Structure formats: structure tokens, C-alpha cells
Design a binder for these strands. Structure first.
Lengths: 148, 226, 210
RNA sequence: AAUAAAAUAUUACUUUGGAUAGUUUAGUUUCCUGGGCGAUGAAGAACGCAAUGAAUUGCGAUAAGUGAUAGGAACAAUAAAAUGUGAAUAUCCAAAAUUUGAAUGCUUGAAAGUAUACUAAGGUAUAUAUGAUAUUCAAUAUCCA
RNA sequence: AAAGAAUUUAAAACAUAUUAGAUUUAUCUGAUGUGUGAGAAUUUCUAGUUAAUCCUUUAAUAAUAAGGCUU
RNA sequence: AAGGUUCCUAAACAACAUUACUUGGAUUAGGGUGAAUCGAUCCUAAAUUACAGAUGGAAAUCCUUAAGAAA
RNA sequence: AAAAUGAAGACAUUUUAACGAGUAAGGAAACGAAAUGGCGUAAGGACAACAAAAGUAGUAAAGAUUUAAAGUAAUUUAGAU
RNA sequence: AUAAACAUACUUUGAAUCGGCCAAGUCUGGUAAGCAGGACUGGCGAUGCGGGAUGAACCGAACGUCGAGAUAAAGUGCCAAA
RNA sequence: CGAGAAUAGAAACUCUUGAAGAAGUAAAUUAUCUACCCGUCUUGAAACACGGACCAAGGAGUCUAACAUGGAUGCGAAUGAGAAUAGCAGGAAAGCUAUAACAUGAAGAGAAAACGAAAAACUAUGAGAGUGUAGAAAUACAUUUAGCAAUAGUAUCUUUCAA
RNA sequence: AGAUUUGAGUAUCGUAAGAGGACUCCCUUAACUUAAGCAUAUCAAUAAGGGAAGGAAGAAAAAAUAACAAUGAUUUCUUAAGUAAUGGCGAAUGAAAAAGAAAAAGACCAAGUUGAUAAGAGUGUAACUAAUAGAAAAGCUAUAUUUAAAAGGGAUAAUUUAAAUUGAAUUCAGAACGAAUAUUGAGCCAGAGAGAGUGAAAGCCUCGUCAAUUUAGAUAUAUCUUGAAAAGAAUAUGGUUUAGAAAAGAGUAAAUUUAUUUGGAAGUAUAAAUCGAAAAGGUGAUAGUAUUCAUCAAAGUCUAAAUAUUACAGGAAAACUGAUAGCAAAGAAGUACUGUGAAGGAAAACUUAAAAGAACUUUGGAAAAAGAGUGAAAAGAGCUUGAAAGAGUAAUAUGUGAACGGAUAAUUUAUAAGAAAAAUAGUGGAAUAUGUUAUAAAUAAAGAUGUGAAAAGAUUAGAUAUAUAAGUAGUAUAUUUAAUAAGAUUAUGUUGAAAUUUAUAA
């Protein structure tokens, strides 16, 4: 909407809101991130204090697929099957039939332990487990299964 | 935020606009229709395997591959020379990855071969194959008796190749065979019985024992040479 | 609406093809309509004009009837012996007339107009029998749904549905609050004007009664 | 102190100028189909051709046009002649297509020319590199009587 | 010392033996055969012993080399 | 050499030759250039350019009778 | 700014009180008690005689010259030629 | 004690700007400068109005459009109101 | 003599001018007061600082791409999927439909290996809801209850040599 | 002499050249610019220079990825991704596998084998030849399996391309105009209300547009026929007697160095100098040696489809420009004109419906002027309208070294405000007010909770017909017989808000 810009409101003003003592000239200190260590050092120190330097080891060819590991906490496990199934198997214990949560089928590899689980037995099938994740699943009456 | 914009080169000669996009649909769709009218079996997008994706990030998913291996055709009792003529993709470059891949893609070929209806090479009713079917039809009936029996009672040498299903039927023209034979059955909610042993299985220790075993092979080799 | 993608609906392209058209397509464009006497004899609506024809001007200052003395296709005009203007010094010049302001009253039919007119006649008949085939098919499908009616109802007067069933919808209260001020003010003024007209109509009727 | 000749100001009319308004046989962009030249001489250049033409258009010693096939009565600034026994007009067709130009017998500056062979004048062929076949040769290059 | 069922049918790599051919050279070429590799224990824990022990070189290790982290 | 019809004649003077022009190298329309012997054409000078050969990534460059079964 | 009223009136409500200079600069649009208010140029989609012939126009459009009126102003409206 | 609810505390985003100049019951260098440089405050810049004849800074006083009065700096022989 | 209070009383008019042009407004001239050349750089220009002879038309913060803040909008542990692409009616550069790869987010710290969050929280002040009394018009006190947002401070937990 | 090798001349039949280069494949070591200087770097496979191509070109069938529950020629799009990495680690530069789509197609030489070997080659044609990757020849054979006389002709149909033809409804009526399409009134067509022309605005005047027809041209599109439907042939795993007891791309891969290049960093790609393999070997991007593992098998060739296009030609569109705008060019525009040359490079749209473009007289040497006439109107060719700057004419007004502006009045001019009407006392009450009745209208429901039906389907168990059959409730389709689970959609009860406010007639 060019009719809502500031240019339409500054017609008749000589400098178009840019100053008379200091004009609107071509440059204001260099093109791009110029002068990162001479006259814009106070900008990089103030707002990007670790911009210049090196840190860590180079990975010549990083295989980004080997670091892929989606995570889900324990409190969010039941949302995979919904509250309808959760209430159905609310009154189960050892011996009878218990729902299985397939984290891998939903795209989750590692199960972390955060928050609180409902007080029902459940079987959790996944690729990795945290120490506190297995504790919270076992403390509620469930079992942990590995995959892949 | 520090800006990283790569417009210092002459981007104006690098700009590609998509004004032809609404007309690619019309071109491709019309050509796709034209091929179907020419020889409708051709556009069927010949059957393809069910192969897993690569890497652990995707390895639980199935996707159509290119071509059945020569071992999968043998398992399904199809000649590799006749396979290409009846809309089957064949990829000799594919090494058989596993027994499960061999079995799963053997069902795909067998299921496709049951839905297949090959028309006679010559439309005349005097074609040799149609005549040949009549000549040995009496042998088929007695053959179909004993096969129907030891199947009905039971429930190492087999035919090398099966027969091509050849007959005369109405032309029900289906634009592709991959969408008729699904890769994966719909997934229901799996559910299991909780046992005492299941409650006792410690998953974390198994993960760390498996990991720490792999990281102690160096300690084994280093101490060996000493 | 045009659906043939080959023809153009650009006004500028149409005029360009009008000025640069060759003689072959200029003849078929300077057509004129036959008169009642000639239409009944030949069953032909219009034919391209020709020299030595007799026409009658129907639009213009002078509606005279004369003989065609010149068919100028470069100027897209025709000339009549009766329509002339004296050129000051004494000589007369013909007055150009567009061929769409005249109707032919006497053909000059040697041998090719005869063949053309016969061809033009059968084309009219062939289209008439084709329209009749379509019309009965449309009528046949109308009877199968309304067997008690006939297709002539579409040519007569239509009686509007006078029933005024209202519907309760929980948005009529919000109608005034869903208009912008420019369209709210116009709506309210129309209501105010309509009410005042009804008030004067009511007062007039009372006076007429009394 | 006085004058309104000049000067100044307003309006009407006229003038120099071509703004403004109305308009478009012209452009710009995108998209669809093709992307069809040449030793069988191309693209380009030059000269010439209309009853009255200088440009432009079309054409090539058959010249603003020829034949054939469609086409059906015109063109016009002024005359002429032709014209339903076929005027205009149209073309992936037929004949024809000047000097040049890759330019290719030799030469070429703004150069007029000119050699041989085949069929006086006219018309064809003869540049360089190259494949196949035919024919004539060269070198003891290898044998060899 | 204490808890532990482990998931279920279409198979090739060849470590090879044993034969049917050919070969002399760092000699090869088929087929018959079994296991391998097969599936209807494993973990924790206390006391020893041995070994390894700051991270990485992305198929697994090793001694060299190189790169990381702190100063 | 350069110019290119400016040459000759007739009609005519809107424009042009710092006034004017009946004049004009200006407007319009016609006419006008005759070679065996004068020149070009022929020969070579300073120099210039080809086929093949040599050089070059390339465009192209060198060579002018040396390198050629050429001339 | 604060009170009162508030489906449509209208003048962007009613009342009271304080306030109003200004270069550079800022206050985009919408927001009923409106988080500034408006004028103008051109083009696109709608609306424009509510009873079935629905904005103006050869009974004179656009434009041009002026005379007057409205608005603090940008500008608008109308008459005459 | 006095004042303070359109008080107070802000948060975010951002414009312009960092050539200055003047006065003085002030200071330093200099013989001195309408010179050069500083401490505190008020101004001019950005500012018109009344007075000083005239003046960026002096004195009174800061500005929506007007009417009527009392005033400020300062004036009351004529220009010029008294 | 007399406040309060109770009881009774009283205000509707003249003149002049105006379609023979009132009031107002506009134009020209005169008279008193008043008025330096516009734009720009500059501490400071009417400047003996620069551009400007006059008029008309053209004339200068726009477009693409990445990020951030902010106001309106839809959905919300999800949002987008006008990613390519594939279909539908209609003939359509428009419209509609696609259980979908992925993008951002739901988990953070470490160079990396290796890991991966509760004492079902605590304290302080704080939004709101009542009941009574009184002034008495609104409103002003007493008292019961709840303690969201925000700020600050605590335990506890993940990662790091280091929070 | 003769048999060969090599090299020439000539003759015949052909072949290359030049134009174009928008898109395509390449050669070459630009600089301006950024880095607030600058020298590496950036600009940048960028400009200029040069070569070669087609309707597309390039690439293309792993000495390829990956470390997986693994993929599998090439090309193009999405994502990865401003990421790994590169970089005076500064400015800045910068991919690819995985994954989602469009399209899909695989075949050859060389080497090896067969040798009464085959106009031209024997210094070798021809035939066979790979993932069960020791092949290759001759004859027998077993089992599964494929199989109509091929190619080429002729005809109909279908799908497309082009041309031609056809293609409705007021030649309506009145008034008025120079002129009707406009205006008033009465009708009609529409699978046609896209558009143009017509004295002026048209759905019905012309041409076209919607629905169509015909005729030609092709398709590797089907049918029938030539054409018999046989003999045989073909695919794969075996057995058998002979024949045989192989090959798999060399100045190549790699190495030392130099130079360029790359995101590729102890060297990603190319080239040059030197060196140079093989009882093979290459790759797994941190150099090195060893042992395992994985995965391919280089150093010859071809290959459609999906993709690009601002040359050029033909079309269609547009929230583009409307004559200082839009291409430089709306007219004889790459034209006039300038330069020795390479090159540079404009301006200029409009009379009217129709020229009906005044035509005869007087004055004048003539050009012209005045009459006259045409036209709806001179709009009179320097022609639609005709602004400002600059002048001329007429009217009005003013005056001593500038002019113009503002406040306030005076003079003059102009504009411009009206037709009703008093007091008191007989009638005469008229709009309206108050409240009484009646009528009409408008205004209250957001939800909550019961009982059903139901299409396309899904699953399971039978039956029938067809095809196929692995020894794994056999599979697949079509039609039916039942049964269970849910069902988009959809029907209908109960429950729960009224009594006010306006208008109208008395």
C-alpha cells in the first residue's frame, strides 16, 4: 500500500525526514558488516559479543541425520493415543491386556522423563530412554521396550 | 541481527519466475491423458517394489522403489524377460537386502499377477494361446482336482515359471497399479499383555551395556599388544 | 461470451483487420438487406451488394430510391445516381452512402447471384430443420417432468409467488451493527424516506375516502 | 503645481504558442505453437522495372507482374484498353529469377576485363580442403626373374 | 546373592571336506555336502583380579600425525 | 585532386545571396559528354596479398620462392 | 482529561475545566465515545430513480476563461461564455 | 514544612544531533582583540511581540481568532499616544 | 428596627431606515499605520554568499530478498502445506479439494564424546467478592474471604570445568 | 619382367564453408566495485575476444551413495540450506546424501570364442557373449514357459490439425435531429448480452459470437482384409557326446612439483614437466602402515520422456503507456542529418458525416482582401478544443528617484433581504397534548437431554463363473447368502424466555 507510506505525508518537507545538518547520503559507515573491528566494534561488542573468533572442532562433512532424535516427555506419552483410549484402560493391572505406545510409529525416538504420568500401567516402546523416564514409567506400574 | 544476503552478484540475470507453472499442469495432464489413450497399459506406471527408506531417521517407513530384483521374480515365478512386457519394473542393480524384503516384494508380484489380465497377442479367436488353452483344458481340470485336494487335506520341487493369465475380457482401464496394491496396511492401536518379566526388563542398563561394550574394544586391543 | 481461443476480442486488432482487409473479404462485408417483395421470392435475408442494383435509402437526410452506380470497396461506400451534390462551380458529384443504410429493391442477377441465392436459400432451410429438432428435444424433456404442462407457458405472462414466509435467524439484530457508516447512513435514509412516502400515501387515501 | 504620451493594473476580443480535454491502424510485458536458411548459391548489398513516380511498397530483362488453382464485378488522381469467353483479390504450387555477396577459373579500387574446354553471339564447367570408385603414373620403399 | 520368555515359517557369503573335468603355474574351473546362522538367555549387585581411562579424525581398531577444551 | 549536373536554354522570383533584384552557382522543365591515334586497360618502383608449408589455446600470424611431385 | 448519555440523531454526541509559540524530527490505515483529522490525481471491484426501464449526457459531456458561494486551509460547489 | 492522580513507574521500537554562538558583581594564555580555551546559569540557534532610532543574543514578556479594561520595560516640546 | 418562617403583591414596550437597494461582501482608487529576496549551507544572509530572465509539460524514498518490533486477523501443542505436484466443475494465469515431504515451535545445555528437567513447589506485596455501621446524595470506616498478572527472593531438577 | 607397400595427377558421384546464436556445450588467469585505505579475497564463468551446435542441447545406465528394518541410470522441481565447510576466519563465498514429485528405457563396440574361415578388410568381415556375472561352438535331449505369416499394402471407426460452409431475434411505431444505435411505446432471440463497423450511445442493420456440418492431414489408436493358423521358433533351469580349458579398455590409474579451480579443509577437478602399475583393483573426503568390513568394477560409444528460450515467425491476453508517455521509430525510422572511419542518431498524430476544399463580381502587378456561396457549425486547409509566458485593440483608473502585499475606513460600481398585517368583544374550534378502549406490528432461545433411519463402504464366514496355483483357513475379479463394528448424513419428543414499545381508528 504505497498510499500509507511516510513519503505521502512528507511531501512539501524539503528533506523528507532525514535532516538538514546531516543529509541522507549514500553510506553511513560502509557496505554490509564493514568495519566490524574499527568503527562498528561497539555494535558487535554490544549486540554480538562472540561474533569474531573460533570455537569447537571442525566437522569436515557433518552427517546431520545421525543427530536426529526427536524427544517426548513422559507426561506427553498418553497424548499419542488420546484420552479416549486412556480412560478405557484406566482400571488395568498386571496380567491383563495393556495398550502399547509406539513412539517410533509417531516419529519419536527418545523418551524423556518430565512431568507426571497418570497412575495406570502402560507399555512404552521406543529407541532410547532417560534414566528418570524409565523410573517414572516403572514407578507407575509399566514396562519399557527397546526398538531398532 | 547480522545480515547475510548474497545479492552482490548480478541476481537480475539469475531470477527465474514461474509464470509457466499454470500451463505445466495443462501440458502434463494432457500428455498424461494422450498416453492413456494410445496404449492404456503404458501409462499404468508399471508396478514397483516396496523398499524401506535409507538411514535410521527414515528406516521405519516404506516407499516405492525401482524395479524388482531377479531373485524376487524367481520367487514369484515370473520370467524376467516377460516381466517388462506386462508392466513390471525390473532392477538387476538391486541387491537383495534381506529375507523380509524378498518375501514382502514376492507377495506384491504374486498379488499383482492375480489381478493381471493379459490380452491375447492376436485379437483373432484363432490365436494359438487361446487354441492351446482349449487343447489342454481337459488336463487343467484334472490338474485342478489334485491341487484342490492336497491343499484341502494339508491345511520340494515347484514350477520354475507360472502361466500368464491370458483371456478375453472387457477393458477396465486402470491408470496405475501401485495405488491398488497398498504398501502398508492401516495401523491400528497395538496392545499387549503385561507380564512380570516385562516389568523387570531394565531398558537403560541394556542401552548403556550395549554402548559401553562398543567403547571398550579399544581397551581390549590396547591391552592385548602389551 | 466468445469461447473460440483463435478469435480476438481486442477492439484495436478488430479495426486493424478492417482497414487492411483485402478485396476478397471487403465484398462480403458491404452487404445489404433485401426488401419484403424480394425476401418472399428468395427466402434470403441479405446478400453482398452489386452494381446496377436498385436500393432505397432508409437512414439519412434524403430517403430516395435509386440505382447503384459505384461500389467503392476501398472507402467501404456505395454511390447512387439520385444522391448528388453540385460542386459550387456547377458540376455534380455523387454522395457516398454506407451500404447498411439501404435495402435492395431490384437485384442485378446474371448467373452467379442465381447460384448464390439458391445456396443462401437452402442454408436457411437446413438451419431451420436443425433448430426444430433441438426444440422438440427440449420440449420432450419438459413433459417427462411436468406432464400436465405445455412448453407454451414460457411465452406468456408469469405470475409471481405472492407467499411471504419469513425465517427467524439470530443475526437480524446484528444487521445494523454489521454495516459501515457510509452504507449504514444510506440504509437508514432509505428507511426514513420510505416511511415518509407511506405517510403521505396514507393521508391521501384518507382524504380520498373522506 | 500640472500632464497623462510612456508605465502600471482588471476584463472582453484578436493574435504568437501548442498546454489541457476527447481519441488511437503504435508500443511494452507474459503466455501458447513452431523454431521450417545455404554450393539446388543463403542472409546482406547494388542496379533496374509502373502510361503519367522522387521516396516507399512489390518485383527481376516474362519487371508494381506471368501460368495454374480458388475467387466472383471492379479500379480510380487523370486518361486509355481489357473484362461474366471471368476485373479485382489469395497462394508453403509452376515457370522465371540482372550485378554481386561463403563467392568458388583469374583479376577486382570507384575495375574497365579476361583463359581453356563443351554445346560467331549466348549458355554451362574449371577455387581450397576432403570420402568412395575408376584410370594414369612415381619411388628397388619390400621382395624379386 | 536378587530378580529374568527371550516372537514365529520363501536365504545367500563360502571356512571348508568329496567327486567330475583341465593345468603346470603364486594353478584354476563345476557340482555334490554339513555346520556356519538360524530365532517358535539377560541384566543388576557386593568382594576380587586383568586391562583400559580428557574428547575427535564420521564402517571397526591399533603406534605416528593432526584437530579440540582450559590457562 | 575534390565537387557531381553546379554546364546550355526557356518559363518563372514564394524562399536564399545581412537593402532590393527583372540577376544568380537559387525554383520548375527540357537538352547536353561521340576516340583504332588523348588517357584508363599493359609494365614494373617503394610496397602489397594468395594455395601448400611453418607457428598459435584461439582469433589469426609468419613466409613471397624459401621449406612444395605447386609456381 | 473527567463525568452523563449512546443503534444512528450529527456538527466526530452533551457538560465542566485546563491548555494552544517552535527549526531538525515524529505522530501509516482501521478501532462509538474512535491510539491526530482531512483535500486532490489516475486506474480496478462494487453502489448511485427500489413499483419490471434504476447516476448524468446533442433540451449540450470532458476541457478552457471569468463571476459568486462553502471551507481556517488543502480544495469544493454553482452561474455565464 | 511545601507541592504531587491527566501523580508516579515505566517497557518496546525509532527519528534527528554531537561545526555552535552570546551575556556575566567569573577564570586561564596573551599587550590586547568582535582573540583562544574553560566552571555555573540563562538565552540565540529553533523566536515572533512592546521598548532601546536601527541590531541573533540587551530590558519586559513568549504567540489559536477577536472585543473591552487594568498593566510591564520605558516614556510625556514636535516627528509620537501621553 | 427587625433575620427565619407563614400569609399576600405587582413585566411585556416606543421611534427611524430599507427592491427608489437595508445589513453584509467583493473589485478599483485614495488616505493613516504597516511590509528587505525567495531556496540552501551556516553560530549568524536582505546580504558585497551561491541558483534563479519568463511560461507550460516532465521531475526525485521505488521494487525484489532476509531478519526484528508493533497494531488488526485465523488456528493454538500446534500453525503452515497456493512445496513441488495431483485432481474437480467450465471453456477459467481465477475458484475448490488433496491425512503430506518438510519449515518454525513443543527441551535445554556441551567443542565433542556422552546426556537430557518437580519438593504435584515455598515466601512477600498485590487484582476481585461479600456482610455491618454511618454520613446520608454520592460516599466514608469496621470486618470475612481470595489471592491471578508483575517484581524480587527461595528450595528442587537437566546440562557444563564453570549457572 | 612380375608380386606388394606407400604417395600423387585426373575423371565421376557427394561432402565442409556463409547467415543466426534468445536458450545449449566450451576456451581465456579483465577491471570498475566491496572490504569505509589496500596488496590475498570480492565483483567473477562476470563484460569484451574466440570456437561449436539443435529444435531443444548437455547428462545418462555406478570403479554411485550410505552404515540403514538400507537404496539403485540421467535430467528437472520442493526440502535439506544461508546449513557442513571455505575466508587478511575479515568483507564475504557456499554445496551434497537421505526424503517428497514430473518422467521413465535400455542397448552396443573392444577383448574372448567359430574357423574347407568371408566387388571390398584375412594386418580380419560376420555369428555368440554375462549378477547363478569360466563365457564361447555342433548335435541330441527333460521340465516349466511365451507364441498367428512378419514386414509392407487397402477400408472404416476414434482422437487431433487446418480450410470452407452454416450460424437466431424490431429491414417495428411516434416525436425530434444535419444525422439515430440515443428518447418514448409495443414486441422478439439467447448453449449467441465477446467484439468491430454504420452521419450519434445497437442483444434483434452488416460482419461475427454460442451450438454445428463438411472436406482434406496425420496417429504407430483399434478394428476387418491381403492371412494361411500350420511348420516351427523363443525364454530359463538341467542331463548328454564332442569342441574349448578364455577375456574384461595403457603413457591409462596413481605418484613428486607447478598453475588454475573447488564449500572440499595434510589436495575436490583439470592441465603441463618428470615418473609410471597390476596373477587386477577403486571408494568409505584428516596424512600414514596393518588387519577386518561394506560397496562398486574406471581408463570406448549410443540412448527417447520429464527441462530452458527477451533471436525469429504466427496467435491470445493485460488493475501496462496514451504522442515530452510507450520501442529510438503511431507518417518514405535506424529515416533526415554529422563524422575519414569505427560509429552517433532525432522531430513530426487529429478539418468535416461527406471536399460539399469557396470559384462568380470589384480592388490589386500579383499574393491577397471585400462581397457571394458550401456546410449543423468555417471547423478555411498553419484547419477538433485552444491555456500560460509575449503582444495589439477597446473600456476603466492612478502617478515627484522602484513596484507588489496586509489592517482600517471613505468614494464609485456590482451583488443582494418583504407581502404579510393590531387591540377588545359574539361564533369558529385545528394541528397538537393528556388517558380510555380496540387493532396491527416489532421485540423474547443460547443450549441441555432422550428415541430412531441411514448411502458409500470395512471385516468375517459360505455359494456360483473365470484366471492362476508354492506343500502355508490358496489368491483376484464379478454376482449373491448371511453375521458383526462403526457410520457421514438425517428425522422426531422433553426441557427453557412476554408483556413491553411503537403506529393506527374512535
Amino acid at each position: 500500500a504505497t498510499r500509507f507510506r511516510q513519503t505521502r505525508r512528507r511531501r512539501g518537507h524539503v528533506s523528507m525526514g532525514y535532516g538538514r545538518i546531516g543529509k541522507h547520503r549514500k553510506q553511513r559507515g560502509g557496505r554490509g558488516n564493514a568495519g566490524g573491528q574499527h568503527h562498528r566494534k561497539t555494535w558487535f561488542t554490544t549486540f554480538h559479543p562472540d561474533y569474531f573468533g573460533k570455537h569447537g572442532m571442525r566437522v569436515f562433512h557433518l552427517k546431520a541425520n545421525k543427530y536426529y532424535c526427536p524427544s517426548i516427555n513422559v507426561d506427553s506419552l498418553w497424548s499419542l493415543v488420546g484420552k479416549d483410549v486412556q480412560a478405557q484402560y484406566k482400571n488395568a493391572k498386571v496380567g491383563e491386556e495393556v495398550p502399547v505406545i509406539d513412539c517410533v510409529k509417531h516419529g519419536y525416538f527418545k523418551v524423556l522423563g518430565k512431568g507426571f504420568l497418570p497412575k495406570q500401567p502402560v507399555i512404552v516402546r521406543a529407541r532410547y530412554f532417560s534414566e528418570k523416564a524409565q523410573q517414572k514409567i516403572k514407578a507407575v506400574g509399566g514396562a519399557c521396550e527397546l526398538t531398532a | 541481527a547480522v545480515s547475510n544476503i548474497h545479492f552482490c552478484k548480478d541476481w537480475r540475470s539469475k531470477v527465474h519466475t514461474w509464470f509457466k507453472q499454470p500451463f505445466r499442469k495443462i501440458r502434463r495432464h494432457q500428455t498424461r491423458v494422450e498416453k492413456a489413450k494410445a496404449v492404456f497399459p503404458a501409462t499404468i506406471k508399471s508396478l514397483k517394489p516396496s523398499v524401506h527408506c535409507m538411514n535410521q531417521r527414515f528406516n521405519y517407513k516404506l516407499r516405492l522403489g525401482r524395479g524388482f530384483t531377479l531373485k524376487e521374480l524367481r520367487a514369484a515365478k515370473i520370467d524376467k524377460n516377460l516381466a517388462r512386457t506386462i508392466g513390471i519394473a525390473v532392477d538387476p542393480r538391486r541387491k537383495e537386502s534381506s529375507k523380509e524384503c524378498l518375501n514382502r516384494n514376492a507377495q506384491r508380484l504374486t498379488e499383482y499377477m492375480n489381478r493381471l489380465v493379459v490380452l491375447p497377442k492376436v485379437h483373432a479367436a484363432t490365436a494359438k494361446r487361446l487354441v492351446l488353452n482349449k487343447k489342454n483344458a481337459e488336463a487343467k481340470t484334472k490338474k485342478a482336482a489334485e491341487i484342490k485336494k492336497f491343499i484341502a487335506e494339508h491345511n520340494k520341487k515347484t514350477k520354475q515359471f507360472n502361466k500368464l493369465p491370458v483371456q478375453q475380457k472387457e477393458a477396465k482401464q486402470v491408470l496405475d497399479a501401485n495405488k491398488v496394491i497398498r504398501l502398508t496396511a492401516p495401523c491400528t492401536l497395538e496392545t499387549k499383555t503385561l507380564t512380570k518379566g516385562m516389568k523387570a526388563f531394565d531398558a537403560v542398563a541394556h542401552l548403556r551395556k550395549a554402548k559401553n561394550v562398543a567403547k571398550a574394544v579399544s581397551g581390549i586391543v590396547k591391552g592385548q599388544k602389551k | 461470451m466468445k469461447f473460440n481461443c483463435k478469435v480476438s476480442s481486442n477492439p484495436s486488432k478488430a479495426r486493424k483487420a478492417l482497414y487492411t482487409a483485402n478485396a476478397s473479404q471487403r465484398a462480403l462485408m458491404m452487404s445489404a438487406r433485401l426488401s419484403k417483395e424480394l425476401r418472399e421470392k428468395y427466402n434470403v435475408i441479405a446478400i453482398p451488394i452489386h452494381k446496377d442494383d436498385e436500393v432505397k435509402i432508409i437512414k439519412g437526410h434524403q430517403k430516395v430510391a435509386g440505382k447503384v452506380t459505384a461500389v467503392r470497396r476501398s472507402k467501404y461506400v456505395i454511390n447512387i445516381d439520385k444522391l448528388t451534390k453540385t460542386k459550387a462551380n456547377g458540376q455534380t458529384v455523387p454522395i457516398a452512402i454506407r451500404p447498411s443504410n439501404v435495402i435492395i429493391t431490384k437485384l442485378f442477377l446474371n448467373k452467379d447471384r442465381e447460384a448464390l441465392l439458391a445456396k443462401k436459400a437452402e442454408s436457411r432451410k437446413s438451419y431451420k430443420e436443425l433448430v426444430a429438432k433441438r426444440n422438440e428435444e427440449v420440449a420432450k424433456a419438459f413433459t417427462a417432468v411436468y406432464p400436465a404442462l405445455n412448453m407454451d407457458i414460457f411465452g406468456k405472462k408469469v405470475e409471481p409467488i405472492t407467499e411471504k414466509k419469513p425465517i427467524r435467524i439470530p443475526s437480524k439484530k446484528m444487521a445494523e451493527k454489521l454495516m459501515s457508516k457510509p452504507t449504514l447512513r444510506a440504509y437508514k435514509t432509505g428507511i426514513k424516506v420510505h416511511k415518509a412516502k407511506n405517510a403521505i400515501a396514507a393521508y391521501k387515501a384518507a382524504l380520498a375516502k373522506k
